[PDB]
Design a binder for these strands. Structure first.
Length: 218
RNA sequence: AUAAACCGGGCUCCCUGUCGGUUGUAAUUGAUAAUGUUGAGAGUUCCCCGCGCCAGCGGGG
């Protein structure tokens, strides 16, 4: 009924953010909407000031994220976390001019042993088409990463392309099956939702608005 | 071009000094490896050269 694009986000370390104005940079357990929009953005070489392109992207695309557990030699490996005592010396003291602090400190959280399968699709008011997105994910223009730039991908961003009625149905065709799914679209049997502050307010730089995921447990 | 980007946790530091593991102790007694057997036959011994009366004879490997 609808055509989906299927991506895999997998690497030794990932980081998907939560509200902070502080030096500790938190992570949640799966990709944020903002972040996925950012990933696609990087693929479609969109500069940071290009509010038109950013808005087009945001209004065109929607995501569903599945949390894939890792299995090594027939054993399950749970997603764990990591805190990096991250230091900066010679950091700007102010936005104007060149005075700087001897040392500042930050704490940054990462996800270890995490892997995701993402399904994205187009909205009825789409400015784009899926062929574009596929081409981009296969040949990105800006460097693609998993949250932070220090976080490479260990598997091609492109997984596949297909067609179904649910996101759930779409994702069924792609191993590993069995993980939880967080979708921007409702799936009939399922009633639980999960609140986040993912949604980028493109008109207002680096500020995010509340939204809700639909949860499809496995 | 993702709470993103830009982005060291970083400098200094003997584990050091003393110390027998030592005295005593048969592995010891018994035990055929024994019966039986032509090495016969068969001139192939591979290469080069000389002489040949084509029976072979000789030189060198």
């Amino acid at each position: 009924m609808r055509s989906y694009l299927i991506l895999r986000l997998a690497g030794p370390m990932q980081a998907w953010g939560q509200p902070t104005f502080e030096g500790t940079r938190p992570t949640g357990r799966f990709p944020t909407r903002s972040g996925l929009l950012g990933l696609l953005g990087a693929c479609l070489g969109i500069q940071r000031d290009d509010t038109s392109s950013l808005q087009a992207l945001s209004e065109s695309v929607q995501f569903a994220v599945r949390c894939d557990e890792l299995i090594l030699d027939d054993r399950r490996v749970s997603v764990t976390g990591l805190r990096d005592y991250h230091t900066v010396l010679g950091a700007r003291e102010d936005y104007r001019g060149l005075k700087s602090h001897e040392t500042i400190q930050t704490w940054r959280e990462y996800l270890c042993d995490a892997s995701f399968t993402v399904a994205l699709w187009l909205t009825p008011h789409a400015t784009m088409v899926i062929s574009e997105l596929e081409k981009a994910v296969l040949k990105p223009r800006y460097t693609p990463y998993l949250g932070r730039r220090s976080c490479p991908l260990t598997h091609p961003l492109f997984l596949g392309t297909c067609q179904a009625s649910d996101p759930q149905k779409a994702l069924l065709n792609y191993e590993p099956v069995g993980g939880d799914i967080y979708s921007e679209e409702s799936v009939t049997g399922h009633h639980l939702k999960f609140t986040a502050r993912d949604e980028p307010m493109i008109t207002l730089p680096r500020q995010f608005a509340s939204r809700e995921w639909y949860v499809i447990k496995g």
